Amino acid sequence: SLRSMISGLGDPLRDKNASTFHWDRQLDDRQLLYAYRNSWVARKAVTIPALDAVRKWRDWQADQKDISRIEATEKRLGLQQKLLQCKTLARLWGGAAIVIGVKDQDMATPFEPETVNKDDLVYLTVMSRRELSPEELEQDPLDEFYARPKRYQVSNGRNLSFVHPSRIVHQVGETHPDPMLATGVNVGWGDSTLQALYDAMMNSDNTQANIASLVFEANVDVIGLPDFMENMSSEVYRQKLLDRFTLAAAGKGINKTLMLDAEEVFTAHSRSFANLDKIMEQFILFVAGAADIPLTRFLGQSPAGMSSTGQHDMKNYHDRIQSIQTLDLQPSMYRLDEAIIRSSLGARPEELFYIWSPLEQMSEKERAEIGKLHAETVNVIAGTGLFMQEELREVFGNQLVETGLYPGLGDLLAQNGNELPEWDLEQRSAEASTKTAEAAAL
Amino acid sequence: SLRSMISGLGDPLRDKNASTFHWDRQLDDRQLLYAYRNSWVARKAVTIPALDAVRKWRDWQADQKDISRIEATEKRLGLQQKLLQCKTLARLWGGAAIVIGVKDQDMATPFEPETVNKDDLVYLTVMSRRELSPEELEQDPLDEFYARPKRYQVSNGRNLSFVHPSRIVHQVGETHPDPMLATGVNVGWGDSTLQALYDAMMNSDNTQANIASLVFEANVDVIGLPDFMENMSSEVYRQKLLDRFTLAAAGKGINKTLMLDAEEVFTAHSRSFANLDKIMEQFILFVAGAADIPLTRFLGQSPAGMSSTGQHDMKNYHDRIQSIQTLDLQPSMYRLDEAIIRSSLGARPEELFYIWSPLEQMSEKERAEIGKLHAETVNVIAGTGLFMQEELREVFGNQLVETGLYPGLGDLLAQNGNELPEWDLEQRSAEASTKTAEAAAL
Amino acid sequence: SLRSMISGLGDPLRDKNASTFHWDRQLDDRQLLYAYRNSWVARKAVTIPALDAVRKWRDWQADQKDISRIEATEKRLGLQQKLLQCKTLARLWGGAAIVIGVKDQDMATPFEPETVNKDDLVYLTVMSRRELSPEELEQDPLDEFYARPKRYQVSNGRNLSFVHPSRIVHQVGETHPDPMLATGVNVGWGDSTLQALYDAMMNSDNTQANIASLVFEANVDVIGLPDFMENMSSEVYRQKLLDRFTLAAAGKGINKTLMLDAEEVFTAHSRSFANLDKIMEQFILFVAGAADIPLTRFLGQSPAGMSSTGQHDMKNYHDRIQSIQTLDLQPSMYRLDEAIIRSSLGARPEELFYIWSPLEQMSEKERAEIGKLHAETVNVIAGTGLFMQEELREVFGNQLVETGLYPGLGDLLAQNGNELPEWDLEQRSAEASTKTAEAAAL
């Protein structure tokens, strides 16, 4: 910091630039509901960066007619919607959690739903931190889920139901830096995301309601009567005055002219609206920066965006979503996603995985131009002898279904699976001339 | 420095330009928590330059079905998330540390977890400088980890647990220049990154709360009564006045006209908002420069970016992240990354390494155009005789999986490994005509 | 210089333009620590032009399986980080030095670690000028390291340890012009780089703290009471006044109107913020020019850069770094870099060297287009008979690994080294028809 001996440039008593500033903590438990429900600024910062992470998602890899019924268990349970509805409650409140139910599982055991090799999966109920209880910490620096609550008092009505954390997907809004020293309602949970952007939000919403108040007082005018103290001294006298000024100040304007006495004044006070529109747009920058959403997605496609050059428009926004898909949704679904591939009739392979779907929407003419190039990498790879032509039917057959170009492509077990008559029992002509190569040459 | 004998241009008593300036050190222990939690400026400067360094990461090299289970030990331990959660605490506080646990390892020995050739690795717990203790320095100028604490008092509750630094990954925020003369809480640790950008942050956040205060006082107006000293002299008299001015100054504006006496004044004082919006944007430059993040990532995609030309948008920002991946995360993981490749059933090769993944997101049409060119370098290289066609199946097979173009490509041990019938037992026709070359020519 | 006889244009008594100016030397020993730690301007000018010189570095040349273990000795000692941590301390302070330790080496001898042909290298400790001592000069104009200190008192605690300069890499910040006449703490060292840019730094940081002070006084207003000398004459009277003006001047603005007496004044004084934002940006030019960093790297990608045309953006900045890599890091590592290639089991070749890695980051699509052209220079060179096809397997095999296109390319000693069956024992058909050329023609 700077401090000058003359002119007081850094003195915390005289100068107040940054020399007299600090931060006090701020807390909120009820107005989180009021702000989310009654403000479009607060509802957009909660929903949309969590809604764009599960729009397109999770194309699997192996096909032994098994990519079809590994999705049938997802569509039955509604795992797409229940991960969206969980992440938003973790975004609004301090955190939320969805709890897994495998059939015939007892209590908060050391609870792995990984060994059960059946087709038994029924429960996916999702609850916020309102309906859970993080009522331990267990600071032992050797346990799995260290500094995490080990036991969840969760039920309504009938029983108590201690639940073990390995039965629970654990979702937080923002990770607290010192989780043992943390306080408030969210003890074993994270912190809300209306915490940091509360000051940026209330600066913008106050100046909207102030500048829209000045438009009513766009020009107020006064009329000064000489002895006005005495006309307004009874009821019968003052209604003789104010009934006539109603009919005389109703129709003034372009097509009527006022008549006044030479004493009466009639000045007009016009307010100023200079530069009050570049102020309104510099505050929604600081909200959109606080939510980490560009103004081509926040505030829709706004005309006041002049750095969206036509190749790198929103490439930073899809770099933020892929840091949620691989850092907040990928680790916490580890007791899932090996249990649901376990529910393919009990059998679980090892080289079975998934990737996340790409996020950029492509045009219909661009998807035709993409599919024209994928057919032409194959023509160059198959032209050189480096892979089996039995082999390329699987790989190019699999890449061309998840593109969505030829979606009705059922080739496994219907179209002789992966076998044609012409692979090995037609390449005799290459095996014939090598038998004639040196035998009929010398 | 300049100094003139007349006009006092460099005199530290008369001129105060830079002649009367110095720096005093500044310290902070509690408001690091308040600023990180309650300010979007401070939380963004901590998280995002440490979050973009572990988004995409570490594609390995050798495939003897071993790139699959060398990642299974990473996904089990959660090494992706626990390196992100470690670097942020080192970024906020003075430093942080994650400690390795190999099964059946005793104490703070001269502790190499490199010789143990088993499949034994369980513990990865990550703690800040709050929960460690750097309680030596050992200034001997010959030891490994010179000027580094040699012993860490770390446990909670039960025992004391001296821990050796070779069991610990050591992460700091900013490296202190003179580590022996250093003081404060962080003795053997680094310095926080809210240290340097504290002045740049508080300049911007003060001027946000001042300019949003002037919008309430956008135009205040006064009304001067002639004898106002005497109406406001009791309770019954002054409520006769202020109840009527409520109903008379509530509805003034476009559709109602005030009536005043000819003595009463009613002036209106309009404040000025000239150039107060180019000031607001020049202070977030100096924050984004202090955090070393461009305003196309800081403050999202901001419309006030006019030097992001369409080829070199953020090429400086990915040059900064690759200087973290190879200078702060690459050396400190040296007792890791040879222990985890040791946990491939005890056997560790020598020519096994990794590179860091590229950081630029590519479009879906651009990844089709990249894969169309990789197939065409092979067609030119295989067309000239310089490499084995047995050999190019491995190299082009390995480069085409980490691209993500043909991800379901299991060719090792399933597709006859690396062997086709047509490599050597089909090139007889080239070996036939050379037997007919000079034998049947003379 | 100019000087006019009338109008006094160059008179050092009357005119003060440049006629009354000189320079006094300036010194600083403690505030180098305060400015580096508490100012983002000073820390960026030290670290970044020294951090971008060791980001990518030193691809070696010969491969006889020896480029792999000539890097294993670098990665073991941490020579990448310890050259970065040395150059920054030389950049901040007057200079710094890293000292080499070869096993079983005694004292400050005439000390060449070049003759020792073993695998013995353990010590790399790096110390600033704080922990060394340049306590001779030896002005004899015939010696190696002329005007350089010949002996370094360096240890802590136990012993004295005279160390010879050929055991030491000598790094300075800025080379002093007259090193024998030099004074201060840095006698045998260089000068700091906060020396020259001290005036440019303090001009910018003062005007940041002044213009952010005016925003608090954006519009101050006064209220003049007629007899205010007499209300403020006791304690009970003045709190009757100031408690009512609190509740009357708290809520003034758009939705409340002040009521004053006709004597009371209420003027409002609005300050001026004209052109105070083009001043703020002309001072960070002169800092970035002083640090010799363009504003597309200093201050991140700033929107106020309008000479970064899309082909020659930062080509001057990489011309400055290559003048550090070949003029400050290349000569001083001469007792290294022949000792570390000596540590390849004692044997040192002669035609073994390195180049520095290129600095421009390339896109992923551009690295595909680069590799498509390198395959096509080979197709034209191998098509003409000017080089052995045995030979091009080494050269194009070596250039295609350091590009990073096909990184898993182990061809030496695994893929029959450099030999195929088809080089010489398949070109019989060219040697056959020349035997049939003139023999079977006449």
Q: What do you get for the CA distance between the two ends of chain B, in Å?
A: 94
Which amino acid is it at A291?
A
What part of B 182-241 touches A (C-beta under 8 Å)? 198-199, 202-203, 206, 208-209, 211-212, 215-216, 218-219, 221
Contact A118, A104 (CB under 8 A): no
Q: CB neighbours of A260 closer than 8 A, spacing ≥ 6? A: A223, A266
Chain B nearest C-alpha distance from A170 (Å): 14
Count of residues making up chain A: 442
How is residue A60 written in tokens? 């699997």
Number of H helices, E strands in chain B: 11, 10
**How far apart are the C-alpha atoms of B402 and B380, rounded to whole Å?**
22
Are B20 and A4 in contact (CB < 8 Å)?
Answer: yes
Are A210 and C38 in contact (CB < 8 Å)?
Answer: no
Q: What angle (nearest 5°) sits at the alpha carbon of residue A324, between those of residues A322 and A328?
A: 140
Q: CB neighbours of B76 closer than 8 A, spacing ≥ 6? A: none
Q: Mutate which of C213, C220, C308 to test chain A, going by most A C-beta atoms within 10 A? A: C213
**How far apart are the C-alpha atoms of C20 and B351, rounded to whole Å?**
69
Q: What angle (nearest 5°) sits at the alpha carbon of residue C197, between those of residues C193 and C201?
A: 125
Could you tell me which chains touch chain B, where touching means 3 or more CB pairs under 8 A? A, C
Measured N-to-C along each axis, helices C40-51 and C198-211 cross at an angle, to the nearest 10 degrees, of: 140
Residue of A nearest to C35 (CA): A1
Which chain B residues have a beta carbon less than 8 Å from that of C439? 442
Count of CB pairs separated by less than 8 Å, A with B: 354
Contact B170, B179 (CB under 8 A): no
Are C125 and B141 in contact (CB < 8 Å)?
Answer: yes
Q: What angle (nearest 5°) sits at the alpha carbon of residue B215, between those of residues B213 and B220?
A: 105
What part of C 134-193 touches B (C-beta under 8 Å)? 154-158
Q: Does C38 touch chain A (CB under 8 A)?
A: yes
| Residue A41: Cβ within 10 Å count | 20
How is residue B417 written in tokens? 């490994």
Could you tell me whether strands C354-355 and C59-60 are parallel, antiparallel, or unpaired per DSSP bridges? antiparallel
Are B300 and A292 in contact (CB < 8 Å)?
Answer: yes
Are B261 and A327 in contact (CB < 8 Å)?
Answer: no
Nearest to C217 by CA among C277, C265, C270: C270
Mapping DSSP to helix (H, G, I), strand (E, B) and coil, where does residue C221 land?
strand
**How far apart are the C-alpha atoms of B239 and C111, rounded to whole Å?**
99
Nearest to B356 by CA among C404, C263, A142: C404
Which chain A residues have a beta carbon less than 8 Å from that of B385? none
Mapping DSSP to helix (H, G, I), strand (E, B) and coil, where does residue B239 land?
helix
Which amino acid is it at B253?
G
- DSSP code string of B7-58: TTSS-TTT--SSTT--B-----SSHHHHHHHH-HHHHHHHHHHHHTTSSS--
Nearest to B148 by CA among B124, B125, B171, B126: B171
Percentage helix, strand, coil for chain A under 3-state DSSP, each rounded to 5: 30, 10, 60
Q: CB neighbours of A344 closer than 8 A, spacing ≥ 6? A: A66, A69, A70
Beta bridge partners of B99: B125, B168
Largest CA distance in chain A: 138
E-strand stretches of C329-394: 354-355
According to the entry, how was the structure determined? cryo-EM
Nearest to C260 among B224, B331, B383 (CB): B224
Q: Does A383 touch chain B (CB under 8 A)?
A: yes
| Residue C224: Cβ within 10 Å count | 10
Residue of B nearest to C39 (CA): B196
Nearest to B358 among C127, C364, C440 (CB): C364
Nearest to B307 among C211, C305, C368 (CB): C305
Residue of B nearest to C31 (CA): B23
Nearest to B18 among C130, C206, C302 (CB): C206
Count of CB pairs separated by less than 8 Å, A with C: 23
Q: How far is CA A201 from CA A293, B33, B149, C254, in A?
A: 14, 21, 45, 21
In this structure, what are the phi and psi dihedrals at residue A126, rounded to the nearest 5 degrees? -120, 125
Contact C22, C29 (CB under 8 A): no
- DSSP code string of A346-360: T---SS--EEPPP-S
Contact B194, B45 (CB under 8 A): yes
In this structure, what are the phi and psi dihedrals at residue B124, rounded to the nearest 5 degrees? -140, 90
**How far apart are the C-alpha atoms of A242 and B128, rounded to whole Å?**
75
Which chain C residues have a beta carbon less than 8 Å from that of A217? 254
Could you tell me whether strands C95-101 and C123-128 are parallel, antiparallel, or unpaired per DSSP bridges? antiparallel
Calculate the CA B315 to chain-centre distance.
15
E-strand stretches of A226-349: 267-270
Are B292 and C392 in contact (CB < 8 Å)?
Answer: no
In this structure, what are the phi and psi dihedrals at residue B372, rounded to the nearest 5 degrees? -75, -25
Which chain C residues have a beta carbon less than 8 Å from that of B24? 34
Radius of gyration of chain B (CA): 35
Nearest to C195 by CA among C22, C41, C21, C28: C28
Which chain C residues have a beta carbon less than 8 Å from that of A373? none
**How far apart are the C-alpha atoms of A334 and A340, rounded to whole Å?**
10
**How far apart are the C-alpha atoms of B415 and B401, rounded to whole Å?**
15
Q: Does C429 touch chain A (CB under 8 A)?
A: no
What does the CA dihedral B28, B32, B33, B38 come to, rounded to 10 degrees? 130
Q: CB neighbours of B127 closer than 8 A, spacing ≥ 6? A: A141, B96, B97, B98, B99, B154
Are C38 and A1 in contact (CB < 8 Å)?
Answer: yes
Chain C nearest C-alpha distance from A269 (Å): 14
- DSSP code string of B386-411: SS-TTTHHHHHHHHHHHTSSS-----
Residue of B nearest to A326 (CA): B55
How is residue B243 written in tokens? 């109840």
Calculate the CA C211 to chain-centre distance.
31
Mapping DSSP to helix (H, G, I), strand (E, B) and coil, where does residue A163 land?
strand
